[PDB]
Symmetry: C3
Subunit: 106 residues, 3 copies
């Protein structure tokens, strides 16, 4: 009864001070929406990030979840790959299924 369609889902983990840079990249590519998980902690190649220890909550690591059509993955990584060469963080690309492609594509 409810048809499912393929989509991609990015999990972008980075320092909160770079939130605007990441969301601007998403908005420019035509990404329709995103969800942000705040105050994260994590282990990186050069030390620990402890969200609870930050004096400014906006400085803690964040995870931006963005469901995007496959066509947007390439242009998005063109922007994110060079950012990650200069700053901490990672992007994980997932395959997902959604019920409403029009909510995610245009």
């Amino acid at each position: 009864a409810i048809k499912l369609y393929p989509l991609k889902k990015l999990e972008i983990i980075l320092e909160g001070a770079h939130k605007e840079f990441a969301t601007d990249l998403l908005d420019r590519a035509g990404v329709k929406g995103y969800t942000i998980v705040g105050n994260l902690s994590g282990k990186g190649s050069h030390g620990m990030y402890e969200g609870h220890l930050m004096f400014n909550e906006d400085d803690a690591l964040i995870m931006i979840i963005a469901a995007v059509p496959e066509e947007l993955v390439g242009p998005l990584l063109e922007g994110f790959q060079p950012f990650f060469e200069a700053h901490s963080g990672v992007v994980f690309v997932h395959d997902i299924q959604v019920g409403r492609p029009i909510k995610f594509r245009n």
Copy 2:
């Protein structure tokens, strides 16, 4: 041994948590996890939001989406379906 399951991520406004968890309960979902205090961008609006995570057998997907359909046609929110594997002792 690895077994296939479907993992749902159901993102919606916290005000509708009770409806969503009751639906999961009524469908026979065995357990769920809730990620709170989320923010985000959606169709006409910036944001409390929550994300409910539920791993279910593939057979439960269709009936759950049917149950969520009237809600999602009237309210903000998204559902992402993932193919995952879970390990169970042999």
Copy 3:
């Protein structure tokens, strides 16, 4: 840009056992992990209503760990004695990454 396959674990457990799980990941050679705090849940991750049960008052966390496929087996074997005594679960995802060297 080429993408390369990798696995991604989402380990859900009580925040009280954070150190056990992170020590197990470090020892197995996992390069990094992300911790999502202040989670809550209800029900069980076991085969039935009673097994590996969580209540709304339990403080949970989710540990996200991108790992090479070869580490999945040893990590699940490592978490097995823990999950017979404590509630929680490991969801294994397929993911694609640009830099597999950062993770393997």
